[PDB]
Amino acid sequence: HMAKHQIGVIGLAVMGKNLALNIESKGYSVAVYNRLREKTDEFLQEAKGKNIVGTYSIEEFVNALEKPRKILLMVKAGAPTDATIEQLKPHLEKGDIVIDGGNTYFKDTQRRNKELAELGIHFIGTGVSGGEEGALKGPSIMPGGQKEAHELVRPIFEAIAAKVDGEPCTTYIGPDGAGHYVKMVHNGIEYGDMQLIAEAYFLLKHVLGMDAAELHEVFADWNKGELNSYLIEITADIFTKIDEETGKPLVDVILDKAGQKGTGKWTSQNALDLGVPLPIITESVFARFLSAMKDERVKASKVLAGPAVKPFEGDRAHFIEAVRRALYMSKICSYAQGFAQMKAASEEYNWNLRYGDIAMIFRGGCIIRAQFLQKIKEAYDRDPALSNLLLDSYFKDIVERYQDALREIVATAAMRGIPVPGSASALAYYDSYRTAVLPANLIQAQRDYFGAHTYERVDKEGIFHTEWLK
Amino acid sequence: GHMAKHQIGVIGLAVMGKNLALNIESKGYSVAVYNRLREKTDEFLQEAKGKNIVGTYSIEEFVNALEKPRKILLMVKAGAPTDATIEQLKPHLEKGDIVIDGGNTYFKDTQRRNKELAELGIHFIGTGVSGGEEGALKGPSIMPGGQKEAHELVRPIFEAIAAKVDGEPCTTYIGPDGAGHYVKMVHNGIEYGDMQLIAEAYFLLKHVLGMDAAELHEVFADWNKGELNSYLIEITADIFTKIDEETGKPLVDVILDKAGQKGTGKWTSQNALDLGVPLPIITESVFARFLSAMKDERVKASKVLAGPAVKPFEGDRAHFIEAVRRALYMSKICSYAQGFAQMKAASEEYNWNLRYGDIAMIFRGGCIIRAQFLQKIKEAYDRDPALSNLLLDSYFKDIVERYQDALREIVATAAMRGIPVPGSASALAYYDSYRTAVLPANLIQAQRDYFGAHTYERVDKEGIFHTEWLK
Ligand SMILES: O=C(O)[C@H](O)[C@@H](O)[C@H](O)[C@H](O)COP(=O)(O)O
């Protein structure tokens, strides 16, 4: 009559190891399983001293958990997650809860949820953010699925999640795939933030001639202000590190080929699906692809001419402040877009997303965490129906004040040949969004000209077609 | 006796399939038509009086009416209706028969159907058709992919009905499986970019120089006589001559700035994300349509968000006009470079051996992006077939070196005046990123290793490294 463990974890790459370890440290007993035995062996070596046990079949695994079973899945997304669910189905019992903590496409979560639902099994797709250090110490947990199912797993999520000022970085997101959706958008925003930081860095490096020491001082100083954040903090730290053999800074030793997981494009791809403008995050993804084409770039550099550029001799302090402001405004524009995407998705899929609550859980644990997120919550506190963050009085006052600096950074980059794709797309967004009559009147005329696609009029209701060819 | 075996059949009698039908018949081919909804066949037959077109009224009758090997053109609604139709054909077809899908189809569905049908010994050609309704009647661009042996059988028909430029039909065998529908998609993507770029030129002239309909028209007419010569510039010049009868305003000034798009518009951008290719200009153009569709939000925001408080323009007018023109051309170059590098990436991924010069060649006529521009692309690949990027070609390299200063001036002026130029701005950014040997992705890679141990490579050593950033 075996003695029953509180939670099961299948999948033992580092993310699942570190989360099982987190869970145990909060006083829960854990059983674990891995298709490959050697990973379970290695985890049990590392895990000695902890209330964690190993199992070597799915029969054993399911049979070692107390009912209603709580199974956390942390296997590779796609077929391997699906193959593990198929393995589980014969042995699960009505009422058991499978939690997919993988980086899963939300529409897979939608399907699994329905498929398991008809069998009487609850499915929670949850995003987990923070990297390895987060998983171990305090991730952001972004769960969606059946509300009643969530309530059973909520105390564990709240136990292991990061806390900001006494408040858990987790909340019920919405039904079916809403959690994995928010996790996707979080990963989009992250790509965005890193690109805009890179631009700020590249500008300082090439306009001001800044070396690693001075760059660190600028970013360290920025992190004590409104830009206070994990990414800017780690950025300022990265510029202090010295490679161990050349004597140069390590960051200058690193090859400028930005990797990215295959999940990095999803936010942009779903934005296209929904009809929401996501220029900054999308440019950031394309910026990574362009950087990956290193060989093409080094070859290109030798034949394609840039502009003639006498050395910069504006005010050094003013320019640093212009970059800082450009970055904050551009970041605001990016989140304004990202939060608009989540709204659109909530409408499409009937999720009733609570945007202040979402901003609240991005506040700690996750990679994009930043003080800034407090003002986003404040925004949705004031108007839960807010259609765009730029309209909230705090962000509106910031963009009207910092727009001159973004304008200057974009104009200056253009003339000096510094690529600032995200900053420039942020400025084009701001000017498009605030403009009541854009040049799409021409585009529509064209489309009716060659395609008979019909148009609408400013002065009367109706659908109109012109015989353009005289 | 004997139902008079026809050379080709067409299923689907919307204006496109009807016009393709009539095009084919006018070239001396006999055509059998069918349509699930009966009244469309009836109507078409009274439209086609005296022409060698016969109606048939069941898939069975339709199939029995055709010469072997059978050649069947599908012009029906994308998705389920197309698969429904193929599924009804299957029992009646034979080893060697040829089903051609001519819709604006997603290339992966073609790939699936191609192999599904190859299993039964039936060939499948997924082919793009561009030019609109008038173009399908008079001479479209045709972009077939599928089995070569099957393409050789229908090639003569495609070549007869296609547009010709300088004696060359705007049609070629693009490659295997979904190759043809892929190229059509990229055609579509490129179109979106071009329209956005010309919209931006218009807005710049409109707002910076306060130009009205009439002078915009003179400027776009002047531009059509030079290197920008193209169907889209041409129709743009004509559009600005139109007057609304009721209001007496330029028609264009009375049209709601809310750009529609087919669900197909986004595909090129989504695919670029799949392949890992930078496609910023066309993607910004799709997002610009989405933005324009949010008209109500925009007018709301316009009452609330302030732009810069900038003085009216006092620079040289002729200079600014030529700067816009040049920025527009260089931007266009950058979009095409991006779109052609996508096709190259695709060709490599799906093993298609695409001929980029032949593709530019079939975009010279029939299609919407048709311009003398396309000749210079053709020439670049005829020079270097494995050219990795069109920017590296002698002709295009000379333009961008001479025009980049217009683009920069335009981007800098747009920024300072608060006039949005998403396409042209991203063109510049791409150009400046492409030609730059060391990008700030070294920081990005440091960041990723710092928080998720994703590892990095280095400039000096030839290995794979991970630092413990907390020591
Ligand atoms: O913590 C999270 O939210 C993710 O699980 C984590 O993995 C990271 O955010 C990116 O997904 C890394 O992806 P790249 O290495 O491709 O940047």
Residue numbers in the entry:
A (entry chain A): 0 to 469
B (entry chain B): -1 to 469
What is the paper's account of this structure, in its own sentences?
Two isomorphous crystal structures were determined. Data set I was obtained from a sample grown in the presence of 6PG and NADP+ and data set II was obtained from crystals grown in the presence of R5P and NADP+. In neither structure was there electron density that could be attributed to NADP+. This value was assigned following several rounds of refinement testing different levels of occupancy to elucidate that which gave clean difference density maps and thermal parameters consistent with the amino-acid side chains in the vicinity of the ligand. We have no definitive explanation of why we only see partially ordered 6PG in one active site of structure II, although we note a difference in the time that elapsed between crystal growth and cryo-freezing. The crystals used to generate data set II were frozen after a period of two months. The only significant difference is that structure II only has 6PG in a single active site and at a reduced occupancy. The overlay of 467 Cα positions of structure I subunit A on subunit B results in an r.m.s.d. of 0.53 Å; for structure II an r.m.s.d. of 0.70 Å is observed from the overlay of 470 Cα atoms. The overlay of the structure I and structure II dimers, 935 Cα atoms, gives an r.m.s.d. of 0.29 Å.
Two crystal structures of recombinant Geobacillus stearothermophilus 6-phosphogluconate dehydrogenase (Gs6PDH) in complex with the substrate 6-­phosphogluconate have been determined at medium resolution. The high degree of structural similarity, efficient level of expression and straightforward crystallization conditions mean that Gs6PDH may prove to be an appropriate model system for structure-based inhibitor design targeting the enzyme from Trypanosoma species.
